[PDB]
Design a protein around this ligand. Structure first.
Ligand SMILES: C[C@H]1O[C@H](O[C@H]2[C@H](O)[C@@H](O)[C@@H](O[C@H]3[C@H](O)[C@@H](O)[C@@H](O)O[C@@H]3CO)O[C@@H]2CO)[C@H](O)[C@@H](O)[C@@H]1N[C@H]1C=C(CO)[C@@H](O)[C@H](O)[C@H]1O
Ligand SMILES: C[C@H]1O[C@H](O[C@H]2[C@H](O)[C@@H](O)[C@@H](O[C@H]3[C@H](O)[C@@H](O)[C@@H](O)O[C@@H]3CO)O[C@@H]2CO)[C@H](O)[C@@H](O)[C@@H]1N[C@H]1C=C(CO)[C@@H](O)[C@H](O)[C@H]1O
Ligand SMILES: [Ca+2]
Ligand SMILES: [Mg+2]
Ligand SMILES: [Mg+2]
Ligand SMILES: [Mg+2]
Ligand SMILES: [Zn+2]
Length: 435
């Protein structure tokens, strides 16, 4: 990558959204963006589930049918998946690698879909559990591979009415990750570096732990819950990171309702994954399932200057927000945003905090303002005492430098929050001469 690598906490780009244009053009489209994302500082890309789904060309990949068909077998009415051909996917992955950008596979293994009808003796009725006809000829399955079966009636959870995979069966373990012929092996063989596990609340953390013991690589699990104890419990049991949904909902409460204290209190009370273990939290402002934060500028300013590992949503970067602002924040994240965090000030519409720096990043001062007016106030930041500080976003309208007195006091300023008029509501500062 250009700056920090994925394993170093680099910025991740979720390279899709719900219902992206079909026709098998997505892999090629994302490939065309790789050079631009490289220059922007992106360290890795998270791609949608790559396998042929039940809905064929209409599938977003979350209804996997033939795990080993990445768009090269004719079935479910199409050869390519909604995203493209296997060849196009491999080309995308290898192109990302050419630019030093890692690739994350979206692993959907709680359930399967598109199976044929067969008599299920455990249910006493017909179920869509016959996967004997998958065109790849790999990982066929039947009622013995789903719940209920002879081992138990169910596991941690189900997803709608889709057949629920029983990972306790050796056949399923072998085909998913526990062998050199597995789905994990296949994904790794074509270049996937890391993993994003879908609906992990639906099965045991032990599944992800064994998968990682076999293949390693960066990993995150999608555990949809606001209970931090549950998310972290899963994170430690699985050995993977978790998406910080608690932070997401708190940022909505705070930035969308002029109520920053709600966020600060959640952080201070360990009610976010990031404020408890920033090495386990994958932060985000929006994703393909939920997008409730309207005031995205202060939200991105926050996750790109605060602790944790941030993910930028495709639509925000490529379609909806001022791309230059996100490019600037990525630079700030990788060059200045390091160390512990000290909250300097906060009220309904203002948030000022300091990143104390680490071995590679000197630290910074973030000043978020939700009000439609210019704001300024004296702040006590002894870390920068007697130093020359520079504003690195340009949001004040130009080149701005300030001299912090020997005591640590300096008059900090932030622009109005009025994106409709070109004002973004935040300023970021650090030592002069960094870059
Ligand atoms: C690279 C790292 O950057 C960020 O981590 C910072 C923490 O958020 C801060 O709290 C602070 O942690 C310090 C510890 O509290 C202290 O006990 C001691 O261990 O020193 C730490 C600082 O050196 O500073 C951290 C570094 O700036 C970010 O939040 C975090 O996600 C990043 N971790 C990445 C790096 C590695 C391996 O080297 C992987 O474990 C993670 O998956 C990466 O995301
Ligand atoms: C070949 C077969 O392998 C797997 O089936 C094994 C089950 O997973 C095990 O749990 C065990 O099932 C036995 C029960 O433990 C026992 O209580 C009793 O119910 O007998 C069961 C066996 O009849 O052993 C099974 C292997 O003998 C895998 O789960 C399963 O999908 C595999 N079936 C393939 C074979 C056909 C036949 O045309 C197709 O229907 C399927 O698509 C194939 O995948
Ligand atoms: Ca399940
Ligand atoms: Mg195509
Ligand atoms: Mg909202
Ligand atoms: Mg105020
Ligand atoms: Zn089971």
């Amino acid at each position: 990558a250009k700056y920090l690598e994925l394993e170093e906490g680099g910025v991740i780009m979720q390279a899709f959204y719900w219902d992206v244009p079909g026709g098998g053009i997505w892999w090629d489209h994302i490939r065309s963006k790789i050079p631009e994302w490289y220059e922007a500082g992106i360290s890795a890309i998270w791609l949608p589930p790559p396998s042929k789904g039940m809905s064929g060309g209409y599938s977003m990949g979350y209804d996997p049918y033939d795990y080993f068909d990445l768009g090269e077998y004719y079935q479910k009415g199409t050869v390519e998946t909604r995203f493209g051909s296997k060849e196009e996917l491999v080309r995308l992955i290898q192109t990302a690698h050419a630019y030093g950008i890692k690739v994350i596979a979206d692993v959907v293994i709680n359930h399967r879909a598109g199976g044929d009808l067969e008599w299920n003796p455990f249910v006493g009725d017909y179920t869509w559990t016959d996967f004997s006809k998958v065109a790849s000829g790999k990982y066929t399955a039947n009622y013995l591979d789903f719940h209920p079966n002879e081992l138990h009636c169910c596991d941690e959870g189900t997803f709608g009415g889709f057949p629920d995979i029983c990972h306790h069966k050796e056949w399923d373990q072998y085909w998913l990750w526990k062998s050199n012929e597995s789905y994990a092996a296949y994904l790794r063989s074509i270049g996937f570096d890391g993993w994003r596990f879908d609906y992990v609340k639906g099965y045991g953390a032990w599944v992800v732990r064994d998968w990682l013991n076999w293949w390693g690589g960066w990993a995150v699990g999608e555990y949809w819950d606001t209970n931090v104890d549950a998310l972290l419990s899963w994170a430690y049991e699985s050995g993977a990171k978790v998406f910080d949904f608690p932070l997401y909902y708190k940022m909505d409460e705070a930035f969308d309702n002029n109520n920053i204290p709600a966020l600060v209190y959640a952080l201070q009370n360990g009610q976010t994954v990031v404020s408890r273990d920033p090495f386990k939290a994958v932060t985000f402002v929006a994703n393909h399932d939920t997008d409730i934060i309207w005031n995205k500028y202060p939200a991105y300013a926050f996750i790109l200057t605060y602790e944790g590992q941030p993910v930028i949503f495709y639509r925000d970067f490529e379609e909806w927000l001022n791309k230059d602002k996100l490019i600037n924040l990525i630079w700030i994240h990788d060059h200045l945003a390091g160390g512990s965090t000290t909250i300097v000030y906060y009220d309904n519409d203002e948030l000022i905090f300091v990143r104390n720096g680490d071995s590679r990043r000197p630290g910074l001062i973030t000043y978020i303002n939700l009000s439609p007016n210019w704001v300024g106030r004296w702040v006590y930041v002894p870390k920068f005492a007697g130093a020359c500080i520079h504003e690195y976003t340009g949001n004040l309208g130009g080149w701005v430098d300030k001299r912090v007195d020997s005591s640590g006091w300096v008059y900090l300023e932030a622009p109005p929050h009025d994106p409709a008029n070109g004002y973004y509501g935040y300023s970021v500062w650090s030592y002069c001469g960094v870059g």
